[PDB]
């Protein structure tokens, strides 16, 4: 049985710009027992029927995780626009996997969480950018932040206790499935 | 932008048809959901349909509510039949781009960025 508890029930989660990857391998994955957490505000899948997940096998499964805002969870999906999906975490158009999200104001309100506002270009799918070099609007990067037109590219989220649910922290975990010409490492109950 | 019509006052067991109407875009490559918000309580997802024509329904409405898209008439209607008092709330429709097909295990407000203003639905006698 796959260690889904250690991903979803983890005490700490990454900033979306510094999203973490965990590898699920050599285990049986009953996704329907993962569902039963009614805390899930979001549970959508792409390229696979969620009923049919119990009978599929994959060569490699990854579990990426991050903290974004309620009104940004919609951006964690294929072929989407936004500051998160273009500078923090991008998904391929042919994405095969699932996106799960839940409200985490209980654990992440008053938490040091960041996202990337400025970038020279959009992320390639599954790219990660941990750079903290100053961004020059019209200027060259690496300029002095005290000067004008020069900003730090990473901004804190500010998950105050009075904001609307659209602004509160939500923890997202993205399971991505792939099966190539390689042996299987993850299988459902029906196809063990 | 989404325009919503069809709500109103209905006796227990009656019928209602909620309409959701897009302006300025086509619902062909979009996913549309119907959401209700009772007084105080949080926006619950009632029924959603993706471009896949794959659908979701809340467990409490499963046998009684029906979502449908008219990709030619650019309308998405929720048929609300066998109405219960528990069904009284403000109903919003929502729309999200869905260029690749979505499959919902659940449907939530966290899944849509465009919303309507709401229609009031009341089931009483
Ligand atoms: C970026 O660098 C500045 C200056 O070193 C620092 O104050 C800030 O906390 C950093 N932000 C990060 C690492 O997210």
Residue pair A94/A125 in contact (Cβ under 8 Å)? The answer is no
Domains in chain A, CATH or no CATH each:
4-191 (3.30.70.1840)
How many of the other CB atoms lie within 10 Å of CB of A112? 9
- Domain limits, chain B: 2-123
Q: Answer whether B102 sits within 8 Å of A73, measured CB to CB.
A: no
Give this entry's resolution in angstroms: 3.0
Q: B93 pairs with which residues across the strands?
A: B34
Structure tokens at A7: 């991903």
- Give the residue, by CA position, lying nearest to ligand 1 atom 5: A132
Residues of chain B contacting residue A43, judged by C-beta atoms under 8 Å apart: 104-106
The number of residues making up chain A comes to: 192
Question: Hey, what long-range contacts does A47-52 have (CB within 8 A, 24 or more apart)?
Answer: A47/A94, A47/A95, A47/A96, A47/A97, A47/A177, A47/B100, A48/A96, A48/A97, A48/A98, A48/A177, A48/B103, A49/B103, A50/A98, A50/B103, A50/B104, A50/B105
B 59-98 near A (Cβ less than 8 A): 96-97
Cα–Cα nearest to A16, from A92, A117, A107, A98: A117
Of A109, A67, A164, A52, the residue nearest B43 (C-alpha):
A164
Q: Cα separations (Å) of A184 from A53, A69, B3, B18, B23? A: 14, 35, 48, 47, 47
A74 near B CB under 8 A: yes
Using an 8 Å Cβ cutoff, are B115 and B94 in contact?
yes
Residues listed for chain B: 125
CATH 2.60.40.10 fits B2-123, yes or no: yes
- Annotate chain B with DSSP letters as a single string: -EEEE---EE-TT--EEEEEEESSS-STTEEEEEEEE-SSS--EEEEEE-TT--EEE-GGGTTTEEEEEETTTTEEEEEE-S--GGG-EEEEEEEEE-SS-EEESS--GGG-SEEB--EEEEE--
Q: Residues 169..188 of A with a Cβ closer than 8 Å to B: which?
A: 170
For the sheet containing B2-5, what is the strand order? B2-5, B16-22, B75-80, B65-70
Q: Which residue has the tokens 């804190």?
A: A156
Chain B stretch 7-26, residues whose beta carbon is closer than 8 A to a beta carbon of chain A:
none
A-chain residue closest to B106, CA distance: A43
Residue A132 beta carbon below 6 angstroms from any ligand 1 atom? yes
Q: Which of A88, A154, A158 to mutate to test the pocket of ligand 1 (most atoms within 8 A of CB)?
A: A154
CB contact under 8 A, A93 and B42: no
Inter-residue contact A141 to A121 (CB < 8 Å): no
């Amino acid at each position: 049985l796959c260690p889904f508890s250690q991903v979803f029930n983890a005490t700490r989660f990454p900033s979306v710009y510094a999203w973490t990857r965990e590898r699920i391998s050599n285990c049986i994955a009953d996704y329907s027992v993962l569902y039963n957490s009614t805390s899930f505000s979001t549970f959508r899948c792409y390229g696979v029927s969620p009923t049919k997940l119990n009978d599929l096998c994959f060569s490699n499964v990854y579990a990426d995780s991050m903290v974004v805002r309620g009104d940004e969870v919609r951006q964690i999906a294929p072929s989407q626009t936004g500051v998160i999906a273009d500078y923090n975490y991008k998904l391929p158009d042919d994405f095969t996997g699932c996106v799960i999200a839940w409200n985490s104001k209980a654990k992440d309100e008053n938490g040091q969480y960041f996202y990337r506002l400025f970038r020279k270009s959009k992320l390639l799918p599954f790219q990660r950018d941990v750079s903290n070099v100053t961004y020059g609007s019209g200027k060259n990067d690496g300029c002095n932040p005290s000067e004008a037109d020069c900003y730090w590219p990473l901004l804190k989220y500010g998950f105050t206790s009075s904001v609307s649910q659209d602004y509160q922290p939500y923890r997202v975990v993205v399971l991505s499935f792939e099966l190539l010409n390689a042996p299987a490492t993850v299988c459902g109950p029906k196809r063990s | 932008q989404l325009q919503e019509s069809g709500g109103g006052l209905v006796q227990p067991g009656g019928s209602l048809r909620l309409t959701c109407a897009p302006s300025g875009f086509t619902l062909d490559y979009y996913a549309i959901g119907w959401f209700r918000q009772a007084p105080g309580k949080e926006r619950e997802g009632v029924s959603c349909i993706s471009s896949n024509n794959s659908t979701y329904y809340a467990d409490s409405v499963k046998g009684r509510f029906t979502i449908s898209r008219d990709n030619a008439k650019n309308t998405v209607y929720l048929q609300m039949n066998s109405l219960k008092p528990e069904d009284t709330a403000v109903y919003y429709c929502a729309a999200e781009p869905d260029y690749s097909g979505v499959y919902y295990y659940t449907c939530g407000w966290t899944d849509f960025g465009s919303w309507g203003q709401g229609t009031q639905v009341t089931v009483s006698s």
